[PDB]
Amino acid sequence: GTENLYFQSMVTVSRPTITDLCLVTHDLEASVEFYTTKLGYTLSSRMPGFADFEGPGVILALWDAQLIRETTGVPALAEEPSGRTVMVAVELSSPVEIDTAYERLRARGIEFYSPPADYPWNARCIYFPGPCGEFWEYFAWLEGGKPGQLG
Amino acid sequence: GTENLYFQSMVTVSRPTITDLCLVTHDLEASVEFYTTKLGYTLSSRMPGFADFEGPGVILALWDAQLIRETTGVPALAEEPSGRTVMVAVELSSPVEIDTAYERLRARGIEFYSPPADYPWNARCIYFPGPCGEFWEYFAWLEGGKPGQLG
16 A cells, blocks of 8 residues: 555656747747747847747747757757648637738738638638748637547 | 827737647657657547647647648648757756656656756756657756846
């Protein structure tokens, strides 16, 4: 009984809490320009080849690929990727808000892969590329909410 | 005065709130195995070529590259990337906790680029690749805290 309590303690894997999402850039200043002027992020800090933005929530950051290689030895992508590498998703509170966001973002020069549409996973979504190989999704659940939830 | 209040309303860019981080995978089941068994994430939902994990905080998700292309037209990377494409960062509460996390993770088969070290940006960090082109950073600030903060 006591040994079991010890066993349970030792084998539990504690899940980490992601605090910062750091995109790999090849042109920091152009990236900073995009997230600030197009998406409304505010600069919080700067270091060599690095900038990040204010919270709340996950901290969005940018770090030059060459600097990552040189300072950490992590082999960050040498050049701009040949396709999209990661997705950053923003849940909105209603499908109709998606169309509003689309028009505001499009007016600021955001280029979308398609106009707003309903998708087979029960969400209304829009998708756009950012300058660090990522794409962004704004989504809102249609009636019935999120499908596929496990029980 | 009234016109100015209207102007300020219209030109403010509202910053989005990232709710989900979705990695692009080429082998969903192997990815699911990594995040669950090595990092302690728990499955929350599944859809075709898709799985995500339980909160709190940002929701970690995985989505097959081929399915993204087919269902959204977003040109997700065709194959495994030639280098690291994005960084997921986990802030810990002290430098000494970094060395503890390193030993626990290493014991579970996480492969690190280097053992724990102090870096020139005033943090003690460890870095490891994941199966979706990303790498992970666990970091904790040394005495004096985060450098480069803007005023």
